[PDB]
Design a protein around this ligand. Structure first.
Ligand SMILES: [Mg+2]
Ligand SMILES: [Mg+2]
Ligand SMILES: [Mg+2]
Ligand SMILES: [Mg+2]
Ligand SMILES: [Mg+2]
Ligand SMILES: [Mg+2]
Ligand SMILES: [Mg+2]
Ligand SMILES: [Mg+2]
Ligand SMILES: [Mg+2]
Ligand SMILES: [Mg+2]
Ligand SMILES: [Mg+2]
Ligand SMILES: [Mg+2]
Ligand SMILES: [Mg+2]
Ligand SMILES: [Mg+2]
Ligand SMILES: [Mg+2]
Ligand SMILES: [Mg+2]
Ligand SMILES: [Mg+2]
Lengths: 176, 109, 97, 189, 46, 111
RNA sequence: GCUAAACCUAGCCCCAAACCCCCACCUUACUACCAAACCUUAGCCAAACCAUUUACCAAAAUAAAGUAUAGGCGAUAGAAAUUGACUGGCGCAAUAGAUAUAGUACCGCAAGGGAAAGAUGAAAAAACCAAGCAUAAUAUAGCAAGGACUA
RNA sequence: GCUACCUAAGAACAGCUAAAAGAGCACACCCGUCUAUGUAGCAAAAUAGUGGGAAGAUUUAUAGGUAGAGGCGACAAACCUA
RNA sequence: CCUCCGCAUAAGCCUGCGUCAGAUACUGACAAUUAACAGCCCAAUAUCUACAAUCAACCAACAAGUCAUUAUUACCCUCACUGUCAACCCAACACAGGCAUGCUCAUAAGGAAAGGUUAAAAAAAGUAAAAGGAACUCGGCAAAUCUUACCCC
RNA sequence: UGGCUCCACGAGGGUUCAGCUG
């Protein structure tokens, strides 16, 4: 299949290759699931072809023929990913009612920030994982003062930004 | 003494360099000779369809029509899936015995 | 060399501005509005100096006790350092002991 | 593009732009964002003042992010272009940009500088119409495929019958992969 | 003798002495990290 | 696939299948005169020898006889106009030795 | 005539208002997967030494009142009862205003310290003067000038 | 991460004389007696010759521990990142 | 014509004299270190281990020493991941300094003291010196040739 | 508070002879 790592031998060095119109999420929604599997592998082989051509263009320092179609193929891949994940999300909402496909909690680390802690699929239960029990999901009364200081740092950046936008508008109204 | 450079597997003593590793997933387990046992089930299998005799191909025409965006909401999928409930007048209660479980995902991609 | 070599863009002033043209209105609101307001209530400013004058130590003391519990933490720390310094200064320095 | 960067008519990915704003300068801006903007790329306008005061032309490109339009063949100056060596070589014109609220649109029957307001006709939905008169203004503006472009019917087969199956399960049954074994339960914490 | 070179590098000593795990072990080291975070430091530890 | 949480295997669970692989490799010209029947590939960091062999067996129907890999360090030595360091990335290189003497040779694109 | 010199907006300051925020990562952080928080601040400093004491900091307008009161009764400290509580700028303008072009570069084992700087314009798809020199080295004698002188 | 001391698991010590001794001469290494150069130096303590120990109370790599009126010290107010 | 040099591992660095192109080991682009070496280990319950090493053989000690598994239970699925470059590290420097271990005992490896003159003084280092031989000097310090004895601690 | 002897050792501090030498 190395002959399909490279494109058609007639096209080698023609300074422009006429191929356009990347896929669209609507067309991919109209297609099936097995069809989307097959189209993913079509696009994957052609994308490996395009990356090979781009790397060899860098190696020989000659201009890449069709960067726009590598952009199109990455767009096609991302649209197909979006479509399949929409079907997965919708079916997950119907059968389980869960918004996210991986479990988590809203924890509070040592520094007292509130984080989303994504869970991590172990073999022994939580209460006897030694490493997990070394990790800490609570803060302490010195984290208190540091939290106040970080909050006020953000408040200062926000006050700076709003004041500057108003000053910009005022000098603009002087100009016009 | 660069703090600012990333910490990698190329960047320590011989034990550090042997332990760190890039993000490749494990494929087996190590035992008792420092001998490595690869588990076939832990090795991922590429499921690749047969693409011979196929018409979908990696671009479309510019003569294709324009159509507006409609993301697949759970309500739309619901109605399209159980119009037979209207005809009368599938659902999973739990997911222990299911292979491709939805919420605590069992599958890849 | 320190002197500017090209003279500046002209500052042009609207003396008949709205703020200029109506400066001073509703001062005398008490004396000729039978005394239910005060020009110190016409003053727009911070809460701790609005109808008050005071000097730099007294301004810091009044700012601490009027708006100090809403201040950012190191702004309080600078204000307490400043009251401490100005106390030492106004009570222990200068001539006229 | 970075912030604090000036829009030239040269596109950001060009040598002229790369050498006009190299990544180690700092510069003041020019003041110019009221999205309701009526000139579009491909319209016929009428320059009022300046060089060729009172003439009619065609809009080629719009610098819509800096309140500029450049009109085709008009409002031009000149530059020695190319010429590759220390002699006179070649002279080519270039077109300087023009300012909005100083150039106006042309009605195709009145041929006068007009001001246009976006009113909402019953045709649908918000199309340029003048304020002194009517005569609605339109909007300005063969490929046969190769070996890797689908036909329109191939792109629009619509082979998705909806069902309560994951792509994983459907492809399993489609290719006939059987998986007898059952996934042992892990703790997720 | 010639006394320029007190820094005799080893990444084990560097990581064990000034590392993130050690900083986070002590409650005073947690405040060291919190101080670097507030200062805005791009690197909070070794 | 890369940047995806893999499902844990306990003892007798199903095999890990992947549908819609996230791995995009590229075939590179060798820099130092590798033999016949050695293809060179540039590969994401998360992809093993076994992953690349099964990738090429399944997707491309290349018979692979041996795969070797190495991690290339990219230079962190370049500096900006800010004297802050520019990191060329780190990549993975594989050397694929073909089966049955199939003898690939890198074509002359850009003639 | 070289080196330069010049510039104005990048932003900042003080107020008002309004309560704000896919993967990996505590193991050698940024690494898919194994058997415990809670305890008076001290001291510099004033007392011209210092030893009891020494303002506030640990939410509280104006006045009562710096009063009652405390106190090596001295430096100083000090109440209460009671009593009327819509955004702007005689701010900075690049050694200033923020440390900030950035907590970066650089320094330090670490905690930590911590910068500098840009100005063509509508479009670049276009002129003069700091110091230091040079044009142009010097001619008895001396704080380098002053009175002068035809010089 | 220097340096003082300790802990854990390592290593080095030619030849001749001698015949398990804190042995002799002497390399490797460790130290720093005398001189000379050097002094904004090659070096914020070096160089060159001269010298002392060199199977031991030795030197030494790696990891760890003791922390500020504290540690540590075969006491020199020595050392604890010039 | 030179060299306790050189090669390798360890530790430390982190692409830092590879190719090409450009400007005045610098800049940019493109390449590259491929596991067999090395690292990342061990399913346990109970239990077994008085005997040194030193050519270990007599023989010699004292300071008394490192190398070790069994009965049974469960376990055949097999070879992934990571290190691998260089003229390099710690000394602000392309620093006469610091730097562990194996091997080569002058190298089969590695290197160059002199930019070009001239041939003043002073200065540094070396070699030679009639006669004399410490008269020098605080003192035989330095050099030169090697040695004796007495005290003090 | 010993005292008198007392052997070996010292980049310790002095002294003598001999040689050797700028
Ligand atoms: Mg006092
Ligand atoms: Mg500043
Ligand atoms: Mg500053
Ligand atoms: Mg001058
Ligand atoms: Mg001995
Ligand atoms: Mg002496
Ligand atoms: Mg000692
Ligand atoms: Mg003493
Ligand atoms: Mg003494
Ligand atoms: Mg130095
Ligand atoms: Mg040689
Ligand atoms: Mg010379
Ligand atoms: Mg003589
Ligand atoms: Mg004499
Ligand atoms: Mg004499
Ligand atoms: Mg001598
Ligand atoms: Mg001795």
């Amino acid at each position: 299949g190395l002959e399909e790592f490279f494109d058609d031998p007639k096209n080698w060095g023609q300074e422009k290759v006429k191929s356009g119109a990347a896929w669209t999420c609507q067309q991919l929604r109209n297609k099936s699931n097995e069809d989307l599997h097959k189209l993913w592998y079509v696009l994957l082989k052609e994308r490996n072809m395009l990356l090979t051509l781009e790397q060899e263009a860098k190696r020989q320092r000659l201009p890449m023929p069709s960067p726009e179609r590598l952009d199109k193929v990455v767009d096609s891949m991302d649209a197909l990913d979006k479509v399949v994940q929409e079907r997965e999300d919708a079916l997950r909402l119907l059968q389980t009612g869960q918004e996210r496909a991986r479990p988590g909690a809203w924890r509070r680390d040592i520094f007292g920030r509130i984080i989303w802690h994504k869970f991590k699929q172990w073999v022994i239960p939580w209460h006897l994982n030694k490493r997990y029990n070394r990790k800490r999901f609570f803060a302490l009364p010195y984290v208190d003062h540091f939290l106040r200081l970080e909050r006020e740092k953000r408040a200062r950046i926000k006050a700076r930004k709003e004041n500057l936008e108003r000053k910009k508008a005022k000098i603009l109204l002087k100009k016009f | 003494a660069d703090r600012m450079s990333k910490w990698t597997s190329k960047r320590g003593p011989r034990s550090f360099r042997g332990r760190k590793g890039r993000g490749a997933k494990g494929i087996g387990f190590l035992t008792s000779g420092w001998r490595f046992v690869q588990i076939k089930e832990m090795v991922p299998e590429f499921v690749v369809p047969d693409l011979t005799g196929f018409k979908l191909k990696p671009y479309v025409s510019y003569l294709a029509p324009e159509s507006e965006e409609t993301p697949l909401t759970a309500a739309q999928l619901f109605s399209e899936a159980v119009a037979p409930a209207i005809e009368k007048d599938g659902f999973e209660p739990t997911q222990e015995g299911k292979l491709f479980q939805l919420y605590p995902r069992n599958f890849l991609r | 060399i320190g002197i500017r070599l090209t003279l500046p863009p002209p500052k042009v002033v609207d003396r008949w501005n709205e703020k200029r043209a109506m400066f001073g209105v509703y001062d005398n609101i008490g004396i000729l509005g039978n005394f239910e307001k005060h020009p110190k209530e016409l003053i727009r400013g911070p809460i701790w100096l609005r109808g008050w004058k005071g000097n730099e130590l007294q301004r810091c003391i009044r700012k601490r006790k009027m708006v100090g519990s809403r201040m950012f933490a190191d702004d309080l720390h600078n204000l307490n350092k400043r009251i401490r310094y100005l106390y030492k200064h106004f009570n222990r320095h200068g001539k006229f002991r | 593009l970075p912030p604090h960067y000036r829009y030239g008519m040269s596109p950001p990915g060009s040598v002229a732009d790369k050498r006009k704003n190299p990544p180690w300068i700092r510069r003041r801006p020019v003041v110019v964002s009221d999205e309701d903007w009526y000139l579009f790329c491909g319209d016929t306008v009428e320059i009022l003042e300046g060089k060729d005061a009172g003439k009619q032309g065609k809009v080629v490109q719009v610098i819509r992010q800096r309140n500029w339009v450049v009109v085709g063949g008009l409002n031009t100056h000149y530059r020695y272009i190319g010429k590759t060596m220390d002699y006179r070589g070649t002279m080519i014109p270039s077109e300087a940009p023009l300012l909005h609220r100083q150039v106006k649109l042309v009605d195709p029957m009145d041929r006068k500088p007009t001001e246009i307001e976006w009113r909402f006709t019953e045709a649908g939905e918000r199309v340029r119409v003048s304020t002194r008169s009517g005569r609605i203004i339109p909007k300005p503006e063969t490929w046969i495929d190769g070996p890797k472009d689908t036909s329109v019917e191939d792109a629009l087969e619509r082979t998705y019958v909806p069902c309560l199956k994951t792509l994983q399960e459907e492809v399993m049954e489609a290719m006939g992969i059987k998986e007898t074994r059952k996934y042992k339960k892990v703790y997720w914490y | 003798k010639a006394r320029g070179n007190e820094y005799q590098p080893s990444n084990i000593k560097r990581k064990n002495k000034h590392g993130w795990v050690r900083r986070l072990s002590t409650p005073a080291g947690v405040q060291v990290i919190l101080r670097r975070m507030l200062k805005g430091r791009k690197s909070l530890s070794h | 696939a890369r940047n995806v949480v893999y499902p844990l295997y306990r003892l007798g669970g199903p095999q890990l299948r992947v549908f819609r692989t996230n791995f995009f490799i590229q075939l590179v010209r060798p820099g130092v005169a590798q033999p016949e029947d050695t293809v060179q590939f540039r590969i994401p960091m998360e992809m093993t020898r076994v992953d690349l062999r099964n990738y090429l067996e399944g997707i491309y129907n290349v018979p692979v006889a041996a795969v070797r890999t190495r991690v290339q360090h990219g230079s962190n030595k370049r500096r900006d106009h800010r004297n802050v360091r520019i990191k060329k990335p780190d990549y993975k290189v594989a050397y694929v030795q073909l089966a049955h003497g199939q003898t690939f040779t890198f074509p002359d694109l850009f003639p």
